[PDB]
């Protein structure tokens, strides 16, 4: 086949970030699905080739088990789909509809990669070892995998709901988002999850902190959904640490969150009294090698914040509790992809 | 001369990290001078040579400047100072008398390297430029080279107090130093110089969380001076940000402060309201190379944390404050010396 030759081309083309503003005017009016179709049909094979050509460079005791095999196997197949629509016509409508059906079957095909790249970490673990070089080398390669995952899931997500059929939210992103409500919306599905496992549940306790316009609610330029992940996973882990460490107690300390917007940062602080982690095995918490057993969620959670220029720290003091802070970009200009 | 040759010889050996077990050990009794004695006489050397190889392998443009030169010289007149004992009798109490006026003149020597290494530094800065790469190659010296200074400095303070004339204190470690009073102390210090320079001083409130001793006054073995440092800094950084950030406005928050013992860990965090930092520049005030101006606390700050497998952290959200956590070593079997 072609499938070398084409990773091989368009590997020499860099990715393009993109910022919350452009991502706004691509899905301005239902006009511009031609322009997405051009941009799209260039920029998704070079952003599929430039991982494409990481995994082959993996080595060959990483890139010769059948997770990465049957990853990349899909990436072909997802590349050589696009390369079809390089020489159709923008002007035709069929071809226009029949790319966004395209891109729909791309994301079902890829929608079992963070488990199957999971396979393949534990494979690693139980067939060369977990040594301290190898985390690093794994962490690397998931980190810029996930984060190129996302940021193509981003592009098809934008596609295939602002052009299809015929506004307030620009497909994913919600130009208006409160804070405060998707902390509400995570911290009611964990409390769901929590009070049928532990038979009881933390309460919640937000606090604003708008210093250019106090007690004026905070809103921001963002994806719902990412913020809601990140924040979802988060609470779970506080919840159960909570409850778990006052299992002989009557008291249930809440889970106090800050929501604070400065003149650039947008930061979100998450307090529990859960006992704690000790300092040492805090990087186990970021690492995918550590966090595997016979979840990624936190990983995958800081990749969302970076994934626009933000981030995703922890800090415990063990014997009281644990905070976290999602540190996100409050203006729109500044919040641009960050591609591997 | 043979300083080449010293510096090769004693660059061969690896530093010797001692723990704080062994720092009470070496200092039980006064019948402990010629154990020391004969350990410092080869230690000392050992440390002093190891920094002054990495010294000689910095690139010619910071190598030839006079203040590398400067520091240098300071360093082989000590090596040299030392070469004098090693053939000297344990016995004769003269060679031990000689030894810790000898040990006070190289600690007087050194007493001002860090404001030498600064000037260093301002003078790369206009003769070169401060790039990103000069920031990380900078950091990496002045992080070993101020962690060896304070390893061989604490050598010389525990020698030249246990063993000069003839114990609650075991020369520079207590060991049973509440951690409470020395907040307060710190505080204190940095209320003084705030109430002279703002006319206005934020408030303490102290808090502890002794988890496995609820109530218990919480005490560690450590040298309070390290400590007074590193909370002495922060303290100041917090007073001018709730001073200078409340300026025009009546209520002055106070600084907030918790103790917490855990299992393993025993954290100091240092809340204020001072308006925060950006994340963007939250790399600023541990790098030295930004913290030049024609201060390194919180950089040296950090770094006596980290020499008994410690940390120093920072984490921000503008718009409301700041927060510190000091974490160290709760137990003193893992307290250990971490050296370059
Ligand atoms: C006590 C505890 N507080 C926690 N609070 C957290 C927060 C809140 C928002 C600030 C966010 C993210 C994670 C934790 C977290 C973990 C643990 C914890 N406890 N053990 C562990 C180990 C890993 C692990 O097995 N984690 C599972 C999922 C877990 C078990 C019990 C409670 C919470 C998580 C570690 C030592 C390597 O981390
Ligand atoms: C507002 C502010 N809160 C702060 N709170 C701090 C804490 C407390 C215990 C948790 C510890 C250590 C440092 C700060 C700190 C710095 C600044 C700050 N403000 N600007 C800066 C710049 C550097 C600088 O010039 N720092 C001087 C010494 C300073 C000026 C005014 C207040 C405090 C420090 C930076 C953007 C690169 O850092
Ligand atoms: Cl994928
Ligand atoms: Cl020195």
Chains 1, 2 share one sequence.
Not at 45 to 68: C, F, G, Q, Y
Not at 116 to 144: C, H, W
Not at 296 to 323: C, H, N, V
């Amino acid at each position: 086949g072609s499938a070398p030759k084409y990773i091989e081309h368009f590997s020499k083309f860099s990715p393009s970030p993109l910022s919350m503003k452009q991502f706004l005017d691509f899905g301005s009016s239902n006009a511009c699905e031609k322009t997405s179709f051009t941009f799209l049909r260039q920029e998704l094979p070079v952003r599929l080739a430039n991982i494409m050509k990481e995994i082959n460079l993996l080595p060959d005791r990483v890139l010769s088990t059948p997770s990465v095999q049957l990853v990349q196997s899909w990436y072909v197949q997802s590349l050589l789909d696009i390369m079809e629509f390089l020489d159709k016509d923008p002007e035709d409508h069929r071809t226009l509809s029949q790319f966004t059906d395209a891109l729909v079957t791309i994301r079902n095909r890829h929608n079992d990669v963070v488990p199957t790249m999971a396979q393949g970490v534990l494979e690693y673990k139980d067939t060369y070892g977990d040594d301290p070089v190898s985390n690093q080398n794994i962490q690397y390669f998931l980190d810029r995998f996930y984060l190129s995952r996302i940021s193509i899931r981003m592009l098809i997500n934008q596609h295939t709901l602002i052009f299809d059929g015929s506004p307030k939210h620009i497909g994913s992103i919600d130009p208006n988002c409160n804070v405060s409500e998707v902390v509400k919306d995570a911290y009611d599905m964990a409390k769901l999850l929590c009070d049928k496992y532990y038979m009881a549940s933390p309460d919640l306790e937000i606090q604003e902190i708008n210093a250019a316009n106090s007690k004026q609610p905070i809103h921001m330029v963002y994806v719902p959904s990412h913020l809601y992940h990140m924040l979802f996973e988060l609470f779970k882990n506080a919840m159960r640490a909570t409850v778990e460490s006052h299992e002989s107690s009557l008291i249930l300390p809440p889970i106090k969150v800050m929501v604070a917007l400065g003149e650039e940062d947008l930061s979100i602080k998450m307090s529990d009294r859960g006992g704690g982690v000790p300092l040492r095995k805090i990087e186990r918490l970021f690492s995918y090698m550590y966090s595997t057993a016979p979840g990624y969620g936190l990983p995958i959670s800081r990749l969302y914040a970076k994934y626009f220029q933000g981030d995703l720290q922890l800090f415990s003091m063990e014997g009281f509790g644990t905070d976290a802070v999602i540190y996100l970009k409050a203006l729109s200009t500044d919040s641009v992809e960050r591609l591997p």
